[PDB]
Amino acid sequence: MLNNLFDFIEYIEYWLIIVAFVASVLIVVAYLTVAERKTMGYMQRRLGPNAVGYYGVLMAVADALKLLSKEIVLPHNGDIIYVMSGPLISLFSVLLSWAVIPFGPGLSLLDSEYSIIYLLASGSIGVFGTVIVGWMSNSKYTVLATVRTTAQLISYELVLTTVVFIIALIVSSLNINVIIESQYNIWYIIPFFPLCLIFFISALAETARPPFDNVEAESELVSGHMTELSASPFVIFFLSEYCSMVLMSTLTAIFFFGGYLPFSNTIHHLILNLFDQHSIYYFIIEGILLSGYLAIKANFFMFSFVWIRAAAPRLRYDLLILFCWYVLLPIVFAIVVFAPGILYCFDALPVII
Amino acid sequence: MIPFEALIPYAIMFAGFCLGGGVMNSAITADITKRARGPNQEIKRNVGED
Amino acid sequence: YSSDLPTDIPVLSKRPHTNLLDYTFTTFDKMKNWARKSSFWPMTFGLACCAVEMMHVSAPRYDQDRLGIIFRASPRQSDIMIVAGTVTNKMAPALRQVYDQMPYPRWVISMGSCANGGGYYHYSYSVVRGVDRIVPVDIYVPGCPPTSEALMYGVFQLQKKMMDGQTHRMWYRSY
Amino acid sequence: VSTFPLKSDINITKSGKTLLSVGQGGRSSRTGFTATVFGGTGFLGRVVVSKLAKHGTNVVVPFRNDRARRQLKVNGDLGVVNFVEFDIRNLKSIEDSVKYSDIVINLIGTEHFSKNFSIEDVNIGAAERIAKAAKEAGVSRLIHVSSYNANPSSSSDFYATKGIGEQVVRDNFGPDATIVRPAPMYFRNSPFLNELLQIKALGGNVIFKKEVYPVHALQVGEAIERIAFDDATAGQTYELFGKERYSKKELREMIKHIIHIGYYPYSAGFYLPAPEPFLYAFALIRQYISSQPRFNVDQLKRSHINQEIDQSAKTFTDLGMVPDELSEYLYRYVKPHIQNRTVYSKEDIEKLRDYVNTP
Amino acid sequence: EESSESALSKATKWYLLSEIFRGLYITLEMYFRAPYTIYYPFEKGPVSPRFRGEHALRRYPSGEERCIACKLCEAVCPAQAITIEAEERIDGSRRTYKYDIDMTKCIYCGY
Amino acid sequence: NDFYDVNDFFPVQVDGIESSLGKYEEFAKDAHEWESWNLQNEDHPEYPVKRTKIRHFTLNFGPQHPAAHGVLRLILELHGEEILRSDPHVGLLHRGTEKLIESKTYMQALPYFDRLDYVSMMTNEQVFSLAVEKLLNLEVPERGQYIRTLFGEITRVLNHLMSVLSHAMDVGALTPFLWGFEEREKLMEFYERVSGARLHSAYVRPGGVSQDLPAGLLDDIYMWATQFGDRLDETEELLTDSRIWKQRTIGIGEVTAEDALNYGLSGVMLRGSGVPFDIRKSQPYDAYDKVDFDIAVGTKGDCYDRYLIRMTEFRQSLRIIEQCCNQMPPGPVKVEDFKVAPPPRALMKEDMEALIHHFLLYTKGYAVPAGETYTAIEAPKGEMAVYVVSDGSERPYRCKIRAPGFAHLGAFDHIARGHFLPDAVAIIGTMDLVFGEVDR
Ligand SMILES: NC(=O)C1=CN([C@@H]2O[C@H](COP(=O)(O)OP(=O)(O)OC[C@H]3O[C@@H](n4cnc5c(N)ncnc54)[C@H](OP(=O)(O)O)[C@@H]3O)[C@@H](O)[C@H]2O)C=CC1
Ligand SMILES: CCCCCCCCCCCC(=O)OC[C@H](COP(=O)(O)OCC[N+](C)(C)C)OC(=O)CCCCCCCCCCC
Ligand SMILES: CCCCCCCCCCCC(=O)OC[C@H](COP(=O)(O)OCC[N+](C)(C)C)OC(=O)CCCCCCCCCCC
Numbered sequence A: 001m002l003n004n005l006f007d008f009i010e011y012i013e014y015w016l017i018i019v020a021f022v023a024s025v026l027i028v029v030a031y032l033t034v035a036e037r038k039t040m041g042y043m044q045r046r047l048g049p050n051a052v053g054y055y056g057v058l059m060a061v062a063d064a065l066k067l068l069s070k071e072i073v074l075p076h077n078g079d080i081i082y083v084m085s086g087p088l089i090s091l092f093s094v095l096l097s098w099a100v101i102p103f104g105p106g107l108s109l110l111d112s113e114y115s116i117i118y119l120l121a122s123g124s125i126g127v128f129g130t131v132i133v134g135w136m137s138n139s140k141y142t143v144l145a146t147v148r149t150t151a152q153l154i155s156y157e158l159v160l161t162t163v164v165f166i167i168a169l170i171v172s173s174l175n176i177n178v179i180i181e182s183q184y185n186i187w188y189i190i191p192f193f194p195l196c197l198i199f200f201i202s203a204l205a206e207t208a209r210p211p212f213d214n215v216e217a218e219s220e221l222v223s224g225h226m227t228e229l230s231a232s233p234f235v236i237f238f239l240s241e242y243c244s245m246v247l248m249s250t251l252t253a254i255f256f257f258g259g260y261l262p263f264s265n266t267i268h269h270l271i272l273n274l275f276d277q278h279s280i281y282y283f284i285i286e287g288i289l290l291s292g293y294l295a296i297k298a299n300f301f302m303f304s305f306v307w308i309r310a311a312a313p314r315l316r317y318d319l320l321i322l323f324c325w326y327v328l329l330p331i332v333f334a335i336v337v338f339a340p341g342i343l344y345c346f347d348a349l350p351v352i353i
Numbered sequence B: 001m002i003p004f005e006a007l008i009p010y011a012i013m014f015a016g017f018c019l020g021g022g023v024m025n026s027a028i029t030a031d032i033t034k035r036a037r038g039p040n041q042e043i044k045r046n047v048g049e050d
Numbered sequence C: 001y002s003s004d005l006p007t008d009i010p011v012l013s014k015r016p017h018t019n020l021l022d023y024t025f026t027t028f029d030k031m032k033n034w035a036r037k038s039s040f041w042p043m044t045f046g047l048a049c050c051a052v053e054m055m056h057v058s059a060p061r062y063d064q065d066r067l068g069i070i071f072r073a074s075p076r077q078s079d080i081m082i083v084a085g086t087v088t089n090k091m092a093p094a095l096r097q098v099y100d101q102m103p104y105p106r107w108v109i110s111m112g113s114c115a116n117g118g119g120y121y122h123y124s125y126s127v128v129r130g131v132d133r134i135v136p137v138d139i140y141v142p143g144c145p146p147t148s149e150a151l152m153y154g155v156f157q158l159q160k161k162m163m164d165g166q167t168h169r170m171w172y173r174s175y
Numbered sequence D: 001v002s003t004f005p006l007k008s009d010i011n012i013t014k015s016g017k018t019l020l021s022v023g024q025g026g027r028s029s030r031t032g033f034t035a036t037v038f039g040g041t042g043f044l045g046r047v048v049v050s051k052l053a054k055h056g057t058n059v060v061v062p063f064r065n066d067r068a069r070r071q072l073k074v075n076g077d078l079g080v081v082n083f084v085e086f087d088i089r090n091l092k093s094i095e096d097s098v099k100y101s102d103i104v105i106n107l108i109g110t111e112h113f114s115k116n117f118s119i120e121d122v123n124i125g126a127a128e129r130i131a132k133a134a135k136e137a138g139v140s141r142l143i144h145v146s147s148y149n150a151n152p153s154s155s156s157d158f159y160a161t162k163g164i165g166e167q168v169v170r171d172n173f174g175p176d177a178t179i180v181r182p183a184p185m186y187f188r189n190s191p192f193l194n195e196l197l198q199i200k201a202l203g204g205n206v207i208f209k210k211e212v213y214p215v216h217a218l219q220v221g222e223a224i225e226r227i228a229f230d231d232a233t234a235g236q237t238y239e240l241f242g243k244e245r246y247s248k249k250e251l252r253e254m255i256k257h258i259i260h261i262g263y264y265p266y267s268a269g270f271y272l273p274a275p276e277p278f279l280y281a282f283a284l285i286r287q288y289i290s291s292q293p294r295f296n297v298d299q300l301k302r303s304h305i306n307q308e309i310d311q312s313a314k315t316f317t318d319l320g321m322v323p324d325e326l327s328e329y330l331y332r333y334v335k336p337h338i339q340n341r342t343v344y345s346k347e348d349i350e351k352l353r354d355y356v357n358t359p
Numbered sequence E: 001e002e003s004s005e006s007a008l009s010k011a012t013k014w015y016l017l018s019e020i021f022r023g024l025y026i027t028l029e030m031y032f033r034a035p036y037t038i039y040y041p042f043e044k045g046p047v048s049p050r051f052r053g054e055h056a057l058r059r060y061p062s063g064e065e066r067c068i069a070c071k072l073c074e075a076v077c078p079a080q081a082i083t084i085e086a087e088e089r090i091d092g093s094r095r096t097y098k099y100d101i102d103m104t105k106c107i108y109c110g111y
Numbered sequence F: 001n002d003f004y005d006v007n008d009f010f011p012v013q014v015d016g017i018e019s020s021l022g023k024y025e026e027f028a029k030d031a032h033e034w035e036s037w038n039l040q041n042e043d044h045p046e047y048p049v050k051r052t053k054i055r056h057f058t059l060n061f062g063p064q065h066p067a068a069h070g071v072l073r074l075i076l077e078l079h080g081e082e083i084l085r086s087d088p089h090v091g092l093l094h095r096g097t098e099k100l101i102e103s104k105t106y107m108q109a110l111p112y113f114d115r116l117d118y119v120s121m122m123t124n125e126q127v128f129s130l131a132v133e134k135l136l137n138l139e140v141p142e143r144g145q146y147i148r149t150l151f152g153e154i155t156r157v158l159n160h161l162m163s164v165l166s167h168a169m170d171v172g173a174l175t176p177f178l179w180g181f182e183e184r185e186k187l188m189e190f191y192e193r194v195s196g197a198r199l200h201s202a203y204v205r206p207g208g209v210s211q212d213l214p215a216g217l218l219d220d221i222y223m224w225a226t227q228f229g230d231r232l233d234e235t236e237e238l239l240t241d242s243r244i245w246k247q248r249t250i251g252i253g254e255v256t257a258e259d260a261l262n263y264g265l266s267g268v269m270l271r272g273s274g275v276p277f278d279i280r281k282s283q284p285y286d287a288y289d290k291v292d293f294d295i296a297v298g299t300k301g302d303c304y305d306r307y308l309i310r311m312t313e314f315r316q317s318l319r320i321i322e323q324c325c326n327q328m329p330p331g332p333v334k335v336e337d338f339k340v341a342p343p344p345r346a347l348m349k350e351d352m353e354a355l356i357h358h359f360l361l362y363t364k365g366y367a368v369p370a371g372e373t374y375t376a377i378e379a380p381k382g383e384m385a386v387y388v389v390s391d392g393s394e395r396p397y398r399c400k401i402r403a404p405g406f407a408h409l410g411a412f413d414h415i416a417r418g419h420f421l422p423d424a425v426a427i428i429g430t431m432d433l434v435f436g437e438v439d440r
């Protein structure tokens, strides 16, 4: 049967597109853990994992298979709910945030004029997902870092949210594609350099990555909130943490570094000049270039996440709350009024085309 | 002294975005064009000589 | 009742694979043991002068991280427990509480003389004479302190044991 | 235990060996014996092995699971606890654990047949091979453990094979062998109690209406220890049980009431009235689909049979030990699973037991 | 009022993270340097002729044991890990029939 | 009491309570239901409030913590995040060293001192060697005392790398920990070449050293000295001027110089508070008078000051290492008295007098003339001293060891009171705790 096969793929192709999409994110997420130790290795004159798989490539899979196959510590015989809600909510929150990231022109699963709100809303759910981790499961180390955790990723969620809106104010749109496509002649790293630093500082603190890493303060709270978590609850939560590092790295490239836009349009046209536009081979290469353009930009921040961790000590917790409220908030509330003033003064109020 | 071993994980992460971008761009474009070829499957999938 | 048990059927560690299932459940055992062989996460239970060597393995010269070794502080996240240093009587009850909290599978490595059989302080009124009186041990590393390579050699030998695990074939053949 | 278990320092076995115990009974003391405890890695073995090693008797523990024998070596000193890898189908490995043994204890016994062994093949085929092989090596004493309701003509597979296990041993080891019948023992991770604590116990009414004579596992652990060091107790049959009679359904509500487990018992699955064919069908279906030992068809019949005391046998007082009651120890063994903790003392178990029986 | 760097100069260093960015760069220098790591067990670290490791009993080229059972061994040993018992051999030359070391009790002192 | 506990406005006399339908007493037996008839206001300071004494959150900074340098049950009583009372529980590593030394000779008791502090070995055994030398009334020759000065400095570099970098690591700076540990691997090579074992070098024995320096060691020691000078610079790059490192440590754990003397603090936590005292200068020993070096004194008595002093101790120690390599004299390395030192093996088998002293040294040991002594040296932690009583026997009678980490941990309550839980880690790190030395 070839008539019942060619139309069968026509009934299943879009599911495979998602599966191809799903694997695309997980591969980056899986190998961010491997890339972290390597990058943090040579920076410390170490070597990093090179003896688990050829040149250490099969290092994440070893940890995933090791952890997933351990005994699960439970308060009672059938008490799986408590040690699963915290990791599951955090994972789904950051997995759904990938429904809006566009890999190119309109290459997003969700395209709506409210992409920014949906992206920020899904961030809030993961925040609520984390505070469940340190809740009612006795009180030794998880509940110590839950009022501490909640008071941190609440406060910086203000500064992170304001930065997003200031970018969306410049384009007058809440659609990520419009934000990406509107940076053709300028990258918001040039005009909004302070915001990129403020965004990245808030991006680090929201994900609880060091230097703002008092959530899992290793020298203070053993393993922090994951001291109870083991085996699969640990994998889900750990996978949740790194998807944010990929997402926040990608978001920084989308907002300030133009997203999938090429570094140079001259080189970009030369490469696409070699492939006939009437054959599908052109559109395979085109997706690779635009996604690779986004990947290189997103790589540098994924490198930057490890880079900052290997060169900056941890920040005392009380100074974190006094930082965003006293310093970052007034600055981010000033550029939110500095931007409209300049745009209106020269009669350049933005519109959506 | 560029350590190429540390760059190995980034190449796969580079290929991580490419697989999503390469498949999504080519598959979505291919399907959309195919459905505009006509009002029926007998002409959608049959490449015309003329 | 009717019963007839053969006599020449060998033991599990000597029994060769015969049918295709004996290759299936050997694949699951190697794949599962390879995960535990590589993701070898001990627990930072440094107690005494032996603990200095356990740090020098993580140092850039040896770099335990290259082998997939990432020390985890909490017992729940750690599948190994390198008992390094003297185990005093005042510590022995606490050591048992830390060991019993490790989810299965779990291994214990005894590094140095004090952890093995008492060491220098074997005739002390407040020193456990060998931690083997408290927790089962899977490999003993001799030294005072064992050199940073001796611990790595002890780690490797235990790894060679883990790769010999035959749990999922044991269900098929010995259970 | 106390300070030294042996009645006399020098003991001569049935084989003419003259064993002299040394030391004051500590960890570094010895007794000159070599007690091979078959099935030592099990629930009962870990008590039999522990008592033998701490008093200086060499223990050879044949195992088939490699990761379960590691914890048995803590009890003894250096060289006291020995290990031999074996299977009941490997005759040569059996003779490795009896060559130097002066005491041979049999604990191997199953309730569920697997894809490699039947109930007969273990309670008989293992026992017959173990007993007969031990004799050929000049083993002085053999001790055996069977069911508490051994009967050659019983319709229950477990009781029928366990009874034949008594006959086939005495036709192989000979008059010297001893048979000990333990009542359902209760201890930490006791299979007798693990069924009562499980929340989702399908057919709970049917399974728990059976009657028993619960015995403390420590005393049975010492019961074999008392028998081991004595040659006067050859060729006997011992049934060990507790004075106060208890039933599972009496225990199950008594257990639940201590854990304080309104609407919850009606919903979580404490009481699951299911048809008798369904229970029979469910056990058969899992017998080919399960991979871990589940509830068996045999335990569906055993639930209809009550424990029977055999008068031809000998009680605890024959060995000089007074059996302990489940009332003095039931609370502590479920204390893991339970403002101000209420400790249900020995007498107060009756007052709990009173509250269960009152409608 | 007695600070050399003006208010704007201090603010720029403060707001633009001057020392952190310098701290990042110096770390990035080490990323382009050869790591110290060696590959055990395919390579070993250095050893010295004075290294104290596994105790071992030597032997003459003629084959006769070097040891004549001083019990100097049992006396010096700080951890009392040496156990010697000796008697006259059959040939009469003084040798030892028992010589045990409790490597779990030894401290690899070197005496 | 033990389980629970129980004014400005005028005490106002009000009696004769009445309503519109009677008196207070007429409806007294009914007004308990009427919540608006109660006569006990709840704002009154004398109002009877009986509340149980629920104890405050007492987290255990217990043995299984990476911050702990051993097994320390630091019972911390905290309300919120401030520190109310701290009661360290030392003893989880009491091996009973002081009890065992009484039964072993003076030569057999030396290896016990390398096991006190896991990182500062040759300084530890130097204080027992000096104690026995003081009682023996014998003085080490020149080249012996120069070897002890050189390895006195190398040990200080080894100890401070463990102290400073772990203090930096416990704050959160992981990178400087690994940069320095390669240097410790490079420095431990020198220990292994002269003595044989990487860490526990039973090298400095009473009466000089164990064996002469191997040829070419000075060349390798000096070559490391040139390279090592940059290693501090990068360490000062990621710590000294970083604002996050300053915030974590500045003003954290303030110790007054007058109050530091009261608790008997010594070492860095006595010059951190401003006192310019140093034992190497107050009591010169083992070719420390010959060399020149500058001591460091702080002014604020907080963790950042003690960091600067410890970093200065790196360069000053490296300064002496250059001087010790340059000014190295020739000659013997141990006292040429066969009664307190083994004779050379070329001479033991040739001279009847040599063999007798070799036989007698290792079976009976040498006898120390009666007396008592208390010799203190500048250990990397601080003032480390041993109290040794000689009973004319080949075994010491009393051997009490003063551990600088022991006294400092006692002053934890005085220092950490009023700080936050993250400041507890900073205070422990700057104390340079090694609980092998604390629980000797
Ligand atoms: N309170 C109680 O537990 C009860 C006691 N009994 C009987 O007392 C006896 C003691 O058993 P118990 O320890 O209590 O419970 P277990 O079932 O846990 O004891 C089983 C022991 O025998 C071994 N075993 C079972 N089948 C085999 C086999 N084919 N080959 C090799 N070994 C086998 C087991 O090996 P391994 O575990 O290593 O796989 C284990 O060592 C049993 O016969 C039991 O039926 C009677 C009623 C209840
Ligand atoms: C989908 C699930 C996730 C991915 C699954 C894979 C995870 C990694 C697997 C680790 C495997 C491992 O460890 O294999 C390596 C181990 C190590 O050898 P050893 O233990 O010393 O025994 C080997 C020596 N003997 C048997 C003599 C004692 O065995 C092997 O050499 C297995 C034999 C090589 C198999 C090559 C053919 C099969 C190729 C299959 C891939 C296409
Ligand atoms: C108009 C200009 C716009 C500038 C926008 C950017 C502002 C950013 C914040 C500046 C203020 C500040 O970092 O302050 C420092 C604050 C508060 O310090 P404080 O409590 O005042 O103590 C200082 C007292 N002094 C004034 C006496 C010195 O704490 C910190 O160390 C925060 C450390 C943040 C580290 C983040 C690392 C991320 C790296 C990202 C790239 C890899």
Ligand code: SF4
Pocket (backbone or CB within 6 Å): C048, C049, C050, C051, C084, C085, C086, C111, C112, C113, C114, C115, C119, C120, C143, C144, C145, C146, E107, F115
């Ligand atoms: S064995 Fe030696 S190095 Fe290890 S803790 Fe004991 S004394 Fe210290």
